[PDB]
Design a protein around this motif. Structure first.
Motif, PDB file in Angstrom:
ATOM      1  N   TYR C   8      29.858 -60.480 -47.883  1.00 23.74           N
ATOM      2  CA  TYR C   8      29.016 -59.378 -47.443  1.00 23.74           C
ATOM      3  C   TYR C   8      28.274 -58.757 -48.619  1.00 23.74           C
ATOM      4  O   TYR C   8      28.844 -58.554 -49.696  1.00 23.74           O
ATOM      5  CB  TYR C   8      29.848 -58.307 -46.741  1.00 23.74           C
ATOM      6  CG  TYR C   8      29.058 -57.060 -46.416  1.00 23.74           C
ATOM      7  CD1 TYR C   8      28.074 -57.077 -45.437  1.00 23.74           C
ATOM      8  CD2 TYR C   8      29.286 -55.873 -47.095  1.00 23.74           C
ATOM      9  CE1 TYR C   8      27.347 -55.947 -45.136  1.00 23.74           C
ATOM     10  CE2 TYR C   8      28.561 -54.735 -46.802  1.00 23.74           C
ATOM     11  CZ  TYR C   8      27.591 -54.779 -45.823  1.00 23.74           C
ATOM     12  OH  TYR C   8      26.866 -53.652 -45.524  1.00 23.74           O
ATOM     13  N   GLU C   9      26.997 -58.456 -48.402  1.00 22.72           N
ATOM     14  CA  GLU C   9      26.172 -57.743 -49.363  1.00 22.72           C
ATOM     15  C   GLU C   9      25.554 -56.531 -48.682  1.00 22.72           C
ATOM     16  O   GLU C   9      25.299 -56.542 -47.476  1.00 22.72           O
ATOM     17  CB  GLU C   9      25.070 -58.639 -49.943  1.00 22.72           C
ATOM     18  CG  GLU C   9      25.585 -59.887 -50.644  1.00 22.72           C
ATOM     19  CD  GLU C   9      26.299 -59.574 -51.946  1.00 22.72           C
ATOM     20  OE1 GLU C   9      26.002 -58.522 -52.550  1.00 22.72           O
ATOM     21  OE2 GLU C   9      27.153 -60.381 -52.365  1.00 22.72           O
ATOM     22  N   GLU C  10      25.321 -55.481 -49.468  1.00 23.23           N
ATOM     23  CA  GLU C  10      24.794 -54.238 -48.921  1.00 23.23           C
ATOM     24  C   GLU C  10      23.416 -54.457 -48.309  1.00 23.23           C
ATOM     25  O   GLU C  10      22.575 -55.165 -48.868  1.00 23.23           O
ATOM     26  CB  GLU C  10      24.726 -53.168 -50.011  1.00 23.23           C
ATOM     27  CG  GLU C  10      26.085 -52.721 -50.520  1.00 23.23           C
ATOM     28  CD  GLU C  10      25.986 -51.815 -51.732  1.00 23.23           C
ATOM     29  OE1 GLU C  10      24.874 -51.670 -52.282  1.00 23.23           O
ATOM     30  OE2 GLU C  10      27.023 -51.247 -52.136  1.00 23.23           O
ATOM     31  N   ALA C  11      23.189 -53.841 -47.150  1.00 31.06           N
ATOM     32  CA  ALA C  11      21.933 -53.977 -46.424  1.00 31.06           C
ATOM     33  C   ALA C  11      21.108 -52.703 -46.376  1.00 31.06           C
ATOM     34  O   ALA C  11      19.879 -52.781 -46.391  1.00 31.06           O
ATOM     35  CB  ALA C  11      22.197 -54.448 -44.988  1.00 31.06           C
ATOM     36  N   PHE C  12      21.746 -51.538 -46.319  1.00 27.97           N
ATOM     37  CA  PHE C  12      21.051 -50.262 -46.278  1.00 27.97           C
ATOM     38  C   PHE C  12      21.177 -49.559 -47.620  1.00 27.97           C
ATOM     39  O   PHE C  12      22.231 -49.614 -48.263  1.00 27.97           O
ATOM     40  CB  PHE C  12      21.613 -49.355 -45.179  1.00 27.97           C
ATOM     41  CG  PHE C  12      21.428 -49.887 -43.788  1.00 27.97           C
ATOM     42  CD1 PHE C  12      22.346 -50.763 -43.240  1.00 27.97           C
ATOM     43  CD2 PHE C  12      20.346 -49.494 -43.023  1.00 27.97           C
ATOM     44  CE1 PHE C  12      22.181 -51.247 -41.961  1.00 27.97           C
ATOM     45  CE2 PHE C  12      20.178 -49.975 -41.743  1.00 27.97           C
ATOM     46  CZ  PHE C  12      21.095 -50.854 -41.212  1.00 27.97           C
ATOM     47  N   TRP C  63      16.415 -52.548 -37.198  1.00 27.10           N
ATOM     48  CA  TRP C  63      16.929 -53.668 -37.980  1.00 27.10           C
ATOM     49  C   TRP C  63      15.911 -54.800 -38.057  1.00 27.10           C
ATOM     50  O   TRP C  63      15.722 -55.402 -39.120  1.00 27.10           O
ATOM     51  CB  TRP C  63      18.240 -54.174 -37.382  1.00 27.10           C
ATOM     52  CG  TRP C  63      18.839 -55.294 -38.162  1.00 27.10           C
ATOM     53  CD1 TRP C  63      18.652 -56.629 -37.955  1.00 27.10           C
ATOM     54  CD2 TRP C  63      19.722 -55.183 -39.282  1.00 27.10           C
ATOM     55  NE1 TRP C  63      19.364 -57.355 -38.876  1.00 27.10           N
ATOM     56  CE2 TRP C  63      20.032 -56.491 -39.701  1.00 27.10           C
ATOM     57  CE3 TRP C  63      20.284 -54.104 -39.968  1.00 27.10           C
ATOM     58  CZ2 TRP C  63      20.877 -56.747 -40.776  1.00 27.10           C
ATOM     59  CZ3 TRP C  63      21.123 -54.362 -41.034  1.00 27.10           C
ATOM     60  CH2 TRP C  63      21.411 -55.672 -41.429  1.00 27.10           C
TER      61      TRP C  63
ATOM     62  N   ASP E  89      28.169 -48.616 -43.740  1.00 28.82           N
ATOM     63  CA  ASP E  89      27.117 -49.603 -43.940  1.00 28.82           C
ATOM     64  C   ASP E  89      27.551 -50.973 -43.441  1.00 28.82           C
ATOM     65  O   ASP E  89      26.768 -51.690 -42.808  1.00 28.82           O
ATOM     66  CB  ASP E  89      26.743 -49.663 -45.420  1.00 28.82           C
ATOM     67  CG  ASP E  89      25.713 -50.729 -45.718  1.00 28.82           C
ATOM     68  OD1 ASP E  89      24.539 -50.543 -45.345  1.00 28.82           O
ATOM     69  OD2 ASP E  89      26.078 -51.753 -46.332  1.00 28.82           O
ATOM     70  N   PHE E  90      28.797 -51.357 -43.724  1.00 27.83           N
ATOM     71  CA  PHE E  90      29.320 -52.625 -43.224  1.00 27.83           C
ATOM     72  C   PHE E  90      29.322 -52.653 -41.699  1.00 27.83           C
ATOM     73  O   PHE E  90      28.898 -53.637 -41.080  1.00 27.83           O
ATOM     74  CB  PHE E  90      30.729 -52.851 -43.772  1.00 27.83           C
ATOM     75  CG  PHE E  90      31.368 -54.124 -43.306  1.00 27.83           C
ATOM     76  CD1 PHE E  90      30.923 -55.348 -43.772  1.00 27.83           C
ATOM     77  CD2 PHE E  90      32.419 -54.097 -42.407  1.00 27.83           C
ATOM     78  CE1 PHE E  90      31.514 -56.520 -43.349  1.00 27.83           C
ATOM     79  CE2 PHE E  90      33.011 -55.267 -41.980  1.00 27.83           C
ATOM     80  CZ  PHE E  90      32.558 -56.478 -42.453  1.00 27.83           C
ATOM     81  N   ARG E  92      27.467 -50.874 -39.613  1.00 29.14           N
ATOM     82  CA  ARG E  92      26.096 -50.922 -39.118  1.00 29.14           C
ATOM     83  C   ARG E  92      25.500 -52.314 -39.274  1.00 29.14           C
ATOM     84  O   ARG E  92      24.844 -52.821 -38.357  1.00 29.14           O
ATOM     85  CB  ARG E  92      25.237 -49.888 -39.843  1.00 29.14           C
ATOM     86  CG  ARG E  92      25.591 -48.451 -39.515  1.00 29.14           C
ATOM     87  CD  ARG E  92      24.347 -47.600 -39.357  1.00 29.14           C
ATOM     88  NE  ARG E  92      23.695 -47.346 -40.635  1.00 29.14           N
ATOM     89  CZ  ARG E  92      22.447 -46.916 -40.764  1.00 29.14           C
ATOM     90  NH1 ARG E  92      21.685 -46.679 -39.711  1.00 29.14           N
ATOM     91  NH2 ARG E  92      21.952 -46.715 -41.983  1.00 29.14           N
ATOM     92  N   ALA E  93      25.719 -52.952 -40.426  1.00 30.69           N
ATOM     93  CA  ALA E  93      25.223 -54.305 -40.629  1.00 30.69           C
ATOM     94  C   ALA E  93      25.889 -55.307 -39.698  1.00 30.69           C
ATOM     95  O   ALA E  93      25.321 -56.375 -39.451  1.00 30.69           O
ATOM     96  CB  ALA E  93      25.425 -54.729 -42.082  1.00 30.69           C
ATOM     97  N   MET E  94      27.083 -54.995 -39.191  1.00 32.05           N
ATOM     98  CA  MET E  94      27.715 -55.886 -38.226  1.00 32.05           C
ATOM     99  C   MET E  94      27.161 -55.679 -36.817  1.00 32.05           C
ATOM    100  O   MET E  94      26.762 -56.643 -36.155  1.00 32.05           O
ATOM    101  CB  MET E  94      29.230 -55.689 -38.240  1.00 32.05           C
ATOM    102  CG  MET E  94      29.907 -56.260 -39.471  1.00 32.05           C
ATOM    103  SD  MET E  94      29.248 -57.873 -39.928  1.00 32.05           S
ATOM    104  CE  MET E  94      28.628 -57.531 -41.572  1.00 32.05           C
ATOM    105  N   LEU E  96      24.416 -53.817 -35.622  1.00 27.72           N
ATOM    106  CA  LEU E  96      22.986 -53.691 -35.338  1.00 27.72           C
ATOM    107  C   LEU E  96      22.293 -55.012 -35.027  1.00 27.72           C
ATOM    108  O   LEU E  96      21.567 -55.074 -34.017  1.00 27.72           O
ATOM    109  CB  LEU E  96      22.296 -52.962 -36.495  1.00 27.72           C
ATOM    110  CG  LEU E  96      22.468 -51.444 -36.511  1.00 27.72           C
ATOM    111  CD1 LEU E  96      21.734 -50.839 -37.692  1.00 27.72           C
ATOM    112  CD2 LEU E  96      21.976 -50.840 -35.208  1.00 27.72           C
ATOM    113  N   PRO E  97      22.449 -56.087 -35.805  1.00 29.61           N
ATOM    114  CA  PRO E  97      21.708 -57.319 -35.517  1.00 29.61           C
ATOM    115  C   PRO E  97      22.238 -58.127 -34.342  1.00 29.61           C
ATOM    116  O   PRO E  97      21.773 -59.250 -34.134  1.00 29.61           O
ATOM    117  CB  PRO E  97      21.857 -58.113 -36.823  1.00 29.61           C
ATOM    118  CG  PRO E  97      23.158 -57.689 -37.349  1.00 29.61           C
ATOM    119  CD  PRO E  97      23.250 -56.224 -37.036  1.00 29.61           C
TER     120      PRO E  97
END
Lengths: 199, 111, 165, 165, 165, 111, 165
Positions: C8-12, C63, E89-90, E92-94, E96-97
């Protein structure tokens, strides 16, 4: 590349990026008549058995294109209205289709083909060898009167696994030389078969 | 006196709100569950999906002890409290200057 | 801290962190943060100026559009109303004309503020327990592009296809 | 006070300050301000008239349009209801017909009031602890042009390109 | 427990249970649930990270469309604000898409998340009695396909035609 | 002493919120309906379509008894209570170390 | 009880009574009602499952259309959250697919549920004094046809034309 090719109605195959990875896509002098073969695939999953509902339009072409608003809060969106023509080879302009194990479940209820009433396994009395010969293993293919191969859907249970062992995949590898009865276990319907083993 | 050993956690919350609390040491103090012949009542938020209770008590500790405000204390029983406010009556008697030797801290149950 | 998965890498980006870095670079001596520090609350009669940024529920994240919209509340705390209004004016002049502006945070990542509008205008809040501090608060609608819109559907599918399936 | 950067100049006017100056010129003896002075609260039985201007969350700022819209609350405090209504009538007759009018504040800057309209009409509020003061309050939507719409993107870019970049 | 009729099969998935299983698979060591466990509340000074999922009244169920829409509130509780924001953040990244994504829960049933939008953005809530815990809360609009849209009208008709009719 | 046998229900609420409470055993304690010469007042929610009342009382039990927080107790009268918070005055006298032998538990009527 | 006029017959069905009868036929052992009985409140540690139906202000009655729309609130009270969610799932699967469904109540009258949609989705409410009960509540918009749209204008006119006329 394909999206911009569709939008600009040109072939950008020969567009070679510059040494610094820069491309320019000139619009054609006259909008070309470029035909495409399009598929609109969608998947609806029942439990773990998906239904692949799709359209097959073999001679689509761009007809119009909506105006693009370039703000800071939205990305560039290309909105072409493809029009499906009638290909003279396949003879149709659009063809809705269904596939998947979910459709194997729902096809009888949908009214396509004969109703599921009976189930049979094609080998009446197969024989397999105890030794690792050519006939060591065999395959069970349960198929209903609908003509649909229900083998992945149907799980088979063996009354006497010591003689012949059959898994949910209808494996007829066998264990010992003997005759074992294999019962194809389904829901409202059931099927029966007998498997013999002889080295 | 009977006293009770507690584990103090001193730290400073930075501008970004990250608590940096580490074991500062130990302190001995007497826990008082009420101002007199009664006990402080436990309270509940009633909007929290759980069974957590709130409690405010007192901790009588010797004057000059190594305890300050915003200094969490954990007892040997596993209970954790947060010291709220400064020490009270950390002063000599106005008439004489007498030192009773004890100052009272207000502690709020955090578990 | 938190042991996130290796893949996992930061997205926001962190809007509060980005603006804290921006206004610590712009105003070095005056401390800005997302919280009231314990040592800052120690002095009240002669209170040092400070700026607080709070992320608030507001705006819809996109997104697919690589946009992260949020409502940011800026609380300027000084010892005088004139100073608070001057600092709030400075903050408004820094934030309002932003349009696609880039800024390299302390993490070394260069964010991009898509736009920054004002939802609620500035107002001098009534004093509370801290009587000598004049606070001027305003809320901004800040849209910032995400670090990456890459999805991790492959890892999610692998998880339940290795454990359960 | 506040040590703002040497390259920054004020962009927005202070609406409260502008109207305080305007109504200290219009009414010299009566005191106007954005606060209740400690010495004004000293006398209640024989209370001196006063006018309070408070900036409130309202209206949207238009940086590109050089417009600063805000909701201004005017509080007229006198010892009589008739006097309060007379002073509120004077305030309304001053603010309402404004359209592009200019006014030189005490700072020497001539601000321009784009337009002034009433959001909430006047009303006589019920007395509080100060029982002998009758207060009439109204809210105005005041739009005033900004001092300058110049942006400082160059300074921010230099800031993050000199420290980090 | 509850003795439901023998002819009834589950028609809706448990969104809270689905996401609890998903984030216990994604985050094995960190505990996630629909409640604050009594043993988790035991330690506060050194608090273990946790995630809470709460189903909230939101969205309209579409029985004919085989869609179950609900508002899911995610509460990320860690001992540090940075850790809470990273975990949010993790999450949300999971979520949202997601678009038609499948996930096999611990029950062995493979659900299907139609879409997962955000209603209220993340925000750091003010501390309560648990002063050393930083909580970041967000609400998501989650739509998930139903297990089966089969109706049981025939059973109800049998019931009221055998008892009364 | 007079005492009163109670039925304790010990359990832990899991992450999903399912209460797993089972009969842990018995305990003997003395109920106190007030802190002194008065009695606590029953309260009502006023938003519940029923006739349920809420009462908070005290349970004086011997020190070291098998009772803990979040441990429901049912009397022989049929009344059920929930033990809220930890034990109070579960300590020796600070000046001497004298053990009064009893600790007071705050109990909230749950029926 | 109430001595209604001899010429009056019931025009509306009792939605709460109809669903109480329906869910006592569907779930015989579990008790359902419009109220919390005194004997049901007697036990908390081992609480029996129950379902509560409350008619709420919602929907517009259509006398000319022979329709009676109302908002029904369903409160499922069990000793476990999983049991409450299972029972709420059962209730939703019963109510939602209804469309012109007839049901014969205990009175011997056969009602007809025109439609049943969900206004507020299910949610697990925080515990109150009754700490060991997990309650899941959800509101439904239920439309049921009236018993008869017959008006009694003749009797109304006769009354005042005999007394006053």
């Amino acid at each position: 590349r394909n999206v911009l090719e569709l939008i600009w109605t040109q072939d950008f195959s020969n567009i070679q990026p510059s040494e610094f990875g820069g491309i320019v896509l000139e619009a054609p002098k006259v909008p070309k008549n470029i035909y495409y073969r399009a598929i609109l695939v969608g998947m609806d999953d029942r439990n773990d058995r998906p239904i692949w509902l799709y359209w097959l339009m073999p001679k689509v072409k761009l007809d119009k294109l909506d105006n693009q608003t370039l703000n800071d809060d939205n990305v560039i969106e290309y909105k072409p209205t493809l029009k499906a023509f009638r290909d003279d080879v396949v003879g149709y302009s659009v063809a809705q289709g269904f596939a998947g194990p979910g459709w194997r479940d729902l096809v009888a209820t949908a009214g396509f083909g004969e109703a599921l009433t009976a189930l049979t396994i094609t080998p009446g009395s197969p024989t397999v060898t105890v030794a690792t010969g050519a006939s060591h293993t065999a395959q069970l293919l349960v198929e209903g009167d609908n003509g649909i191969n229900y083998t992945p859907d149907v799980v088979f249970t063996s009354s006497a696994p010591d003689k012949a062992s059959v898994s949910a995949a209808g494996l007829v590898t066998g264990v010992a030389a003997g005759s074992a009865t294999i019962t194809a276990t389904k829901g409202a319907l059931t099927a029966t078969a007998t498997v013999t083993v002889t080295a | 006196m009977n006293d009770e050993t507690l584990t103090v956690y001193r730290g400073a919350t930075d501008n970004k709100g990250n608590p940096n609390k580490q074991v500062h040491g130990t302190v001995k103090g007497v826990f008082a569950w009420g101002p007199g012949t009664s006990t402080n009542k436990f309270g509940r938020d009633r909007n929290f999906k759980g069974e957590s209770s709130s409690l405010t008590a007192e901790l009588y500790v010797k004057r000059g002890a190594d305890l300050k405000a915003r200094d969490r204390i954990r007892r040997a029983n596993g209970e954790e409290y947060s010291v709220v406010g400064h020490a009270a009556w950390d002063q000599g008697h106005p008439f004489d200057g007498f030192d009773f030797g004890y100052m009272v801290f207000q502690v709020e149950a955090v578990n | 801290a938190v042991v996130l998965p290796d893949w996992y890498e930061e997205a926001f980006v962190n809007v509060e962190n980005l603006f804290i870095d921006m206004f610590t670079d712009l105003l070095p001596d005056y401390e800005s943060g997302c919280w009231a520090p314990d040592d800052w609350l120690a002095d009240e009669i002669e209170v040092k100026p400070t700026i607080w940024f709070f992320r608030l529920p507001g705006g819809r994240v996109d997104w697919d559009g690589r946009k992260d919209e949020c409502q940011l509340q800026v609380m300027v705390v000084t010892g005088s109303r004139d100073d608070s209004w001057r600092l709030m004016d400075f903050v408004r002049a820094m934030l309002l004309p932003m349009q696609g502006d880039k800024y390299k945070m302390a993490d070394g990542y260069t964010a991009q503020i898509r736009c920054a509008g004002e939802v609620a205008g500035p107002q001098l809040l009534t004093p509370g327990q801290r009587i000598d501090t004049r606070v001027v608060t305003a809320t901004f609608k800040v849209s910032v592009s995400m670090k990456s819109a890459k999805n991790y559907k492959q890892k999610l599918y692998e998880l339940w296809q290795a454990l359960r399936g």
